[PDB]
Amino acid sequence: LGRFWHISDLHLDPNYTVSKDPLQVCPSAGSQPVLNAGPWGDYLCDSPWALINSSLYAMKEIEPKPDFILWTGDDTPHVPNESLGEAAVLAIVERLTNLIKEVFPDTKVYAALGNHDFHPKNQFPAQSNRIYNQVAELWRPWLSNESYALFKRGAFYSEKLPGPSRAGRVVVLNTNLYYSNNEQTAGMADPGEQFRWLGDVLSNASRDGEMVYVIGHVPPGFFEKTQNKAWFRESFNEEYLKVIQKHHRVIAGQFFGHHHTDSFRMFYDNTGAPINVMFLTPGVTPWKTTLPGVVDGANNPGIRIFEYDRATLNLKDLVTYFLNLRQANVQETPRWEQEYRLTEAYQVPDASVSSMHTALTRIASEPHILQRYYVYNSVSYNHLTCEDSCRIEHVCAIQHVAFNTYATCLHG
């Protein structure tokens, strides 16, 4: 039984300070007063360095020897571009990289850039640039030579699983190329030829008898905390769905972030059969989001471990851990606790496609399972009841990655 960590959306705020001025605690809160900020963070702020360091050492305490770590980006704070140049972005990425290397010196990391890991934010080019080159240098110890060249060109690559094993491969995507706010790829059908490349990779895996873990930052489909918010341009969404529908037999799981909230996405074929599942891991940052439509969109800091079969890559379980920031901010040393274990939370035998489909049906049909899922969705920050509209938003987001099916589900 192997284990691997998944962390995402650390969103370091370099300027977080416990200030008596509510408006000078953290630039990531904008003009929102931050009253009684604590040393481990604030729900209105991105992560202080203390919080990120705490998350890494909590991972080390819980499991110091993972098979590997998946890290899906977003290292910089939610601030105006003018406050955050390219040098600062690269320095922040390097500092988080070096922290992971120092806490887990000998552990392979599969790292994907998040939409904030660029200057200007979200403007990911479909070609090589200074940031891709420097980050390729930073992550070079985890990259094969082919992966190094590929990352320099488009920040995507495919790496063997650690050790001698030829079971399994991790495909690291740069899905920031598909975010609608990315003007660098507007008018591009297959930016960086990623989709084509991905198809080839998956084909090779089927030829070679490998299973694949696909990771990326920005997921296809919709954001469960509001209605009709998708990140991918529609054509990119459709292409990603086509890729999954063709190659689901070699994909043992998908792992993404960018929501900061805990949810999952099911993929179905045209017969209704469940064919794949994507796990949206929560963020370390607790930052209350400024996205229109979302109310009280903060979360507790979360980290996640997966238990998997090394021979087959079958996902056996996941365990999500969290820091109750309200409690941690009055304590000498913050202690992370198990938030939940998937199989226990949803009464399913594993984290496979069938099990995740069962979990979705339970969420959609049983009020206490829906409430359990909803509390975990904010990493146990928001304990209010998920009523009918909330239920529909979450069920439709989980069940429908396609635009048309999601909207029709929303009609309900």
Ligand X SMILES: *[C@@H]1O[C@H](CO)[C@@H](O)[C@H](O)[C@H]1NC(C)=O
- Pick one of Zn ion, ligand X, none as the site partner of residue 115 (Cβ within 5 to 8 A by kind): Zn ion
The residue (of 186 and 291) whose beta carbon lies closer to Zn ion is 291
Which part of the chain contacts Zn ion (CB under 5 A), choosing from 134-142, 238-246, 251-259, 263-271?
251-259
CB of 57 to ligand X, least distance (A): 4
Which part of the chain contacts ligand X (CB under 6 A), choosing from 53-61, 255-263, 296-304, 316-324?
53-61
Query: Packing angle between helix 353-365 and helix 388-399, nearest 10 degrees?
Result: 160
The residue (of 50 and 294) whose beta carbon lies closer to ligand X is 50
How many chain residues interact with Zn ion (CB under 5 A)? Answer: 4
Structure tokens at 396: 């439709």
Per rule CB under 6 A, is residue 57 in the interface with ligand X? yes
CB of 341 to ligand X, least distance (A): 24
Name which position in 115, 122, 174, 285 contacts Zn ion (CB under 5 A).
115
Nearest-angstrom CA–CA distance, 171 and 177: 16
In one letter, which amino acid is 381? Answer: Y
Name which position in 74, 117, 159, 262 contacts Zn ion (CB under 5 A).
74
Per rule CB under 6 A, is residue 148 in the interface with ligand X? no
Residue nearest to Zn ion (CB): 258
Task: Assign 352 to helix, strand or coil.
Answer: coil
In one letter, which amino acid is 229? Answer: K
CB of 71 to Zn ion, least distance (A): 13
CB of 331 to ligand X, least distance (A): 12
> 394: annotated binding-site residue?
no
- Pick one of Zn ion, ligand X, none as the site partner of residue 53 (Cβ within 5 to 8 A by kind): ligand X
255 with 6: CB under 8 angstroms?
yes
- Pick one of ligand X, Zn ion, none as the site partner of residue 148 (Cβ within 5 to 8 A by kind): none
Name which position in 258, 265, 316, 357 contacts Zn ion (CB under 5 A).
258
Task: Assign 69 to helix, strand or coil.
Answer: strand
Spell out the residues 6+ positions from residue 363 whose beta carbon is closer than 8 angstroms to its own: 369, 370, 373, 394, 395, 398
Task: Assign 402 to helix, strand or coil.
Answer: coil
302 with 339: CB under 8 angstroms?
yes
> 6: annotated binding-site residue?
no
> 11: annotated binding-site residue?
yes
The counts of H helices and E strands in the chain are 12, 12
Per rule CB under 6 A, is residue 50 in the interface with ligand X? yes
SS (H, E, C) 25-55: CCHHHCCCCCCCCECCECCCCCECHHHHHHH
Per rule CB under 6 A, is residue 103 in the interface with ligand X? no
The residue (of 155 and 313) whose beta carbon lies closer to Zn ion is 155
> 21: annotated binding-site residue?
no
Cβ-in-10-Å burial (0-12, 13-18, 19+) of 347 comes to: exposed
Query: Packing angle between helix 353-365 and helix 367-377, nearest 10 degrees?
Result: 110
The binding site for ligand X (CB under 6 A) comprises: 50, 53-54, 57
The binding site for Zn ion (CB under 5 A) comprises: 74, 114-115, 258
Binding site for Zn(2+): which residues?
Answer: 9, 11, 74, 115, 217, 258, 260
